[PDB]
Design a protein around this nucleic acid. Structure first.
Ligand code: MG
Ligand code: MG
Ligand code: MG
Ligand code: MG
Ligand code: MG
Ligand code: MG
Ligand code: MG
Ligand code: MG
Ligand code: MG
Ligand code: MG
Ligand code: MG
Ligand code: MG
Ligand code: MG
Ligand code: MG
Ligand code: MG
Ligand code: MG
Ligand code: MG
Ligand code: MG
Ligand code: MG
Ligand code: MG
Ligand code: MG
Ligand code: MG
Ligand code: MG
Ligand code: MG
Ligand code: MG
Ligand code: MG
Ligand code: MG
Ligand code: MG
Ligand code: MG
Ligand code: MG
Ligand code: MG
Ligand code: MG
Ligand code: MG
Ligand code: MG
Ligand code: MG
Ligand code: MG
Ligand code: MG
Ligand code: MG
Ligand code: MG
Ligand code: MG
Ligand code: MG
Ligand code: MG
Ligand code: MG
Ligand code: MG
Ligand code: MG
Ligand code: MG
Ligand code: MG
Ligand code: MG
Ligand code: MG
Ligand code: MG
Ligand code: MG
Ligand code: MG
Ligand code: MG
Ligand code: MG
Ligand code: MG
Ligand code: MG
Ligand code: MG
Ligand code: MG
Ligand code: MG
Ligand code: MG
Ligand code: MG
Ligand code: MG
Ligand code: MG
Ligand code: MG
Ligand code: MG
Ligand code: MG
Ligand code: MG
Ligand code: MG
Ligand code: MG
Ligand code: MG
Ligand code: MG
Lengths: 57, 137, 190, 76
RNA sequence: GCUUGACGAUCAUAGAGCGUUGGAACCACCUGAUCCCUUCCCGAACUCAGAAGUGAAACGACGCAUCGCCGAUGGUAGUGUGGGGUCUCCCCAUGUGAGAGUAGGUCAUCGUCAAGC
RNA sequence: CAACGGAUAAAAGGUACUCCGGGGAUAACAGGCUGAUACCGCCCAAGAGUUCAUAUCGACGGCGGUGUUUGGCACCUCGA
RNA sequence: CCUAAAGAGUAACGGAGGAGUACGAAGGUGCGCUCAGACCGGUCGGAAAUCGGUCGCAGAGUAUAAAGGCAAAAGCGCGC
RNA sequence: ACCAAACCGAUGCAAACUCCGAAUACCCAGAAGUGCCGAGCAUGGGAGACACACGGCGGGUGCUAACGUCCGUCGUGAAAAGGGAAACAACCCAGACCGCCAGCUAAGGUCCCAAAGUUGUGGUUAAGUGGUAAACGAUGUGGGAAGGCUUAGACAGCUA
């Protein structure tokens, strides 16, 4: 019911929409892993920034 | 030289040439055709030049259709003239060509003779061409 | 002969269909018509492209074999690449024993050497059309419609009402009160 | 050249969309002519302006003969 | 439950045409222009007083796909995001996805009130 | 008061005799980018060459190269 | 109006056109009515005048450019 | 016997054509979590700035020329060092509080200059192609689907 998310690429030069998607999950600097719920609102912020995150399920 | 008898407006923007030719890519009237496999634009003096070379070689019978009409005006600014100060006057007319458009058609001749004549014309055109027969669909 | 093999297609879409033509070398297809749900099938390009140079390819009746379940179909429409010219998509219409169907049938022009307008008057021959929309029962669907141009004079026009048809065959356009030039004779260009 | 002229833009279009709450006197659409017609609860200005006459919610319904597009105000 | 008249809902899958049929009641055409009223002239239209004729026209119902109007499945074009190429243009991954055309569908479906069986 | 947010009620020119403050924010010379133009190659082959397209030329059309003329731009230099 | 990238806005010595008015009724209201065009028939007018009929549905009209509108016609006529 | 409106069918084009018509973007409402502990708004003290540049995408102008010029929207420089692209503001990766003779990676790379595979498996090229450029031309070479002749003697040579 929860998913690991790790930021593996820099936030420099990304679209402001994608910057706020990463900040919306609570990720702040590279190689940071967070505990978030697998809810449809949260699952939609991951897909918008798929190329930046590494999802461990 | 082909060109419209009258136009609503004298000038046009440059525009862009994009996409394939899903319309105008079938052998409709004739029985052998010269299709375009690359995009570009014919300047209505090459269309006219390539038509001498095609009717002269058959020189006995046959019917020929031209499926391309140059209807887009283009402008050129004269020499030793700065930038700005309006838009230049119309010099010549062109036709937008996309990959797959059929240019010339012919019938009433042997298949071997059609191949010869369409090679005469294709050497006057600034784009790649092809030889296409006719199908039911 | 007129045999085609097919497999049941499962992945639909532009990306899935573009992958068949690039990697697998197959062709997407559809089998609709009759009284059934439409079925999406796939077939190999080099086999459909070999059935297509038969002269009576569209006006004949195919024996499609989807998986191991075969049936009766007919080439109803065809999609080709605008530039290269190979076939990309094709749809098949199911054939029912008692049901009217339509098709495109090419015209077999004959004996143009001894036409009166050519041997005597020194004129040309122009085929204005090369196929006719027909409508008939499947049992009497012709491979070709034969037009005879022996007794044709210079300047004489041939329309749909001039040519003969086999039994139980309608020319569709003629039924709409629209008969149109099939072929004609005219003087030489030069 | 004999061409360099134009006019100031007039800021036309829809001002309140479907579902938005409205008040009396609120302007809904600015038009030249009537792309949209005044429905229930809406009035028409002398320059073909649609303004709310009651409180509610925009509807944006098309109905009736002539295929007209209507703007009406409904209950909230 | 059925027919006719009035008022609506919905605006062609509901329209157009082509044939058949209805006058007991209703409606229409109809008789006349003294009165109310009318015509830039005219009882044609509007209006009044009616009950000798006909459902001819009009209207309504019922039939047919000929035109019209709807119209899938599949494929194609375009396209947001990320990455490439031979970079005037395209391609790959992923989400989205027409217009035209094909098979086909349609000779509408309801609501309130009043008269006659 | 149209120079249309209208300096005043009321206003044109010369300077090669000129002068000051500044600018490579902006021209003339030379350099750079480009290559329409210019020059030089090539593709097709109607034809001229008594016959014969290519000994020698070559229409109507097309594809390139070099910076090489006339230009385009305004990147360097106006405390030379 | 286009450029202008389907909310608003958006530059060029970019591509095209108009204004510096008119109306005491060309405004208000009530009542009434549908245009251009085609064909056929009719005294000279004849392709085109006024009249009759059929088809047509807005291809007419709107004081004035263009765009967007117009059957409760926003088009046309009369009384006050 | 030339032309020929009008109509029927077939067939193309349009920034100032539209019977149609997206993806995005924009407006609104209800919801979970995150926000560096705030983002939003209002009222006041102080400003600077109003000479922008290149790259991607959508366009006008030019020659779909220019490190040209004019707009819309993103990214970087301005005001951003470090590693890569040989050197190379604006390209790629990534945003420097200080120290360490510690480890793991990004783009890019691993024969020597010069840190790290003369690594492994199956093919291609003979051109130093790689390590610049078109129309067009050529028995270069690898792979694939098919065809026409052929022990009734096929294709080249030679004798009638
Ligand atoms: Mg980036
Ligand atoms: Mg342009
Ligand atoms: Mg098109
Ligand atoms: Mg895709
Ligand atoms: Mg203008
Ligand atoms: Mg202008
Ligand atoms: Mg403007
Ligand atoms: Mg505007
Ligand atoms: Mg009012
Ligand atoms: Mg009466
Ligand atoms: Mg349709
Ligand atoms: Mg679909
Ligand atoms: Mg689709
Ligand atoms: Mg569709
Ligand atoms: Mg002034
Ligand atoms: Mg001013
Ligand atoms: Mg002033
Ligand atoms: Mg002076
Ligand atoms: Mg002196
Ligand atoms: Mg000085
Ligand atoms: Mg000074
Ligand atoms: Mg300078
Ligand atoms: Mg200046
Ligand atoms: Mg010098
Ligand atoms: Mg210079
Ligand atoms: Mg210098
Ligand atoms: Mg060069
Ligand atoms: Mg000669
Ligand atoms: Mg030089
Ligand atoms: Mg120079
Ligand atoms: Mg500049
Ligand atoms: Mg100087
Ligand atoms: Mg000095
Ligand atoms: Mg010096
Ligand atoms: Mg417009
Ligand atoms: Mg806009
Ligand atoms: Mg927009
Ligand atoms: Mg601006
Ligand atoms: Mg003026
Ligand atoms: Mg008026
Ligand atoms: Mg009035
Ligand atoms: Mg008349
Ligand atoms: Mg009305
Ligand atoms: Mg358009
Ligand atoms: Mg217009
Ligand atoms: Mg803090
Ligand atoms: Mg402040
Ligand atoms: Mg302050
Ligand atoms: Mg300021
Ligand atoms: Mg400025
Ligand atoms: Mg500037
Ligand atoms: Mg700028
Ligand atoms: Mg700039
Ligand atoms: Mg650009
Ligand atoms: Mg540009
Ligand atoms: Mg351009
Ligand atoms: Mg610049
Ligand atoms: Mg540029
Ligand atoms: Mg920054
Ligand atoms: Mg600065
Ligand atoms: Mg840096
Ligand atoms: Mg560096
Ligand atoms: Mg370099
Ligand atoms: Mg370095
Ligand atoms: Mg390591
Ligand atoms: Mg790596
Ligand atoms: Mg060194
Ligand atoms: Mg080493
Ligand atoms: Mg090795
Ligand atoms: Mg080398
Ligand atoms: Mg090399």
């Amino acid at each position: 019911a929860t998913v690991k998310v790790t930021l593996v690429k820099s936030l420099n030069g990304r679209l402001a929409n994608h910057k706020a998607c990463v900040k919306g999950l609570g990720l702040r600097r590279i190689n940071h892993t967070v505990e978030v719920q697998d809810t449809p609102e949260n699952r939609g912020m991951i897909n918008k920034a798929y190329y930046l995150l590494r999802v461990e399920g | 030289m082909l060109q419209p008898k009258r136009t609503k407006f004298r000038k046009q923007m440059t525009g862009h040439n994009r996409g394939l030719a899903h319309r105008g890519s079938k052998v409709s009237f004739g029985e052998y055709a010269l299709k375009a496999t690359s995009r570009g634009r014919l300047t209505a003096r090459q269309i006219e030049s390539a038509r001498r070379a095609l009717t002269r070689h058959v020189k006995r019978g046959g019917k020929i259709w031209i499926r391309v009409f140059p209807d887009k005006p283009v402008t050129k600014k004269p020499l030793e003239v700065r930038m700005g100060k309006g838009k230049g006057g119309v010099e010549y007319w062109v036709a937008q060509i996309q990959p797959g458009k059929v240019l010339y058609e012919i019938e009433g001749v042997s298949e071997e003779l059609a191949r010869e004549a369409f090679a005469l014309a294709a050497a006057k055109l600034p784009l790649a061409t092809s030889f296409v027969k006719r199908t039911v669909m | 002969d007129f045999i085609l093999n097919a497999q049941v297609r499962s992945d639909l879409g532009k990306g899935a269909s573009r992958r068949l033509r690039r990697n697998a070398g197959l062709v997407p297809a559809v089998v609709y018509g009759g009284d059934k749900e439409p079925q999406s099938v796939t077939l190999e390009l080099r086999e459909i492209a070999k059935l297509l140079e038969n002269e009576a390819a569209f006006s004949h009746v195919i024996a499609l074999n989807v998986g191991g379940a075969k049936e009766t179909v007919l080439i109803k429409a065809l999609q080709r690449h605008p530039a290269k010219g190979f076939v990309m998509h094709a749809d098949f219409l199911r054939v029912v024993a008692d049901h009217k169907l339509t098709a495109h049938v090419p015209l077999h022009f004959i004996n143009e050497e001894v036409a009166v307008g050519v041997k005597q008057a020194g004129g040309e021959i122009s085929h204005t059309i090369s196929e006719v929309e027909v409508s008939c029962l499947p049992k009497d669907l012709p491979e070709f419609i034969e037009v005879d141009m022996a007794k044709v004079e210079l300047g004489q026009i041939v329309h749909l009402s001039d040519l003969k048809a086999p039994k139980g065959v309608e020319l569709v356009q003629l039924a709409h009160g629209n008969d149109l030039a099939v072929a004609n004779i005219h003087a030489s260009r030069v | 050249t004999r061409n360099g002229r134009d006019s100031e833009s007039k800021r036309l279009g829809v001002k309140l969309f479907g579902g938005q709450a409205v008040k009396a006197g609120n302007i809904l659409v600015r038009q030249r002519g009537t792309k949209f017609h005044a429905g229930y609860g809406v009035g028409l200005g002398k320059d073909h302006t649609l303004f709310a006459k009651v409180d509610g919610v925009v509807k944006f319904e098309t109905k009736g003969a002539f295929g007209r597009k209507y703007v009406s105000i409904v209950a909230a």
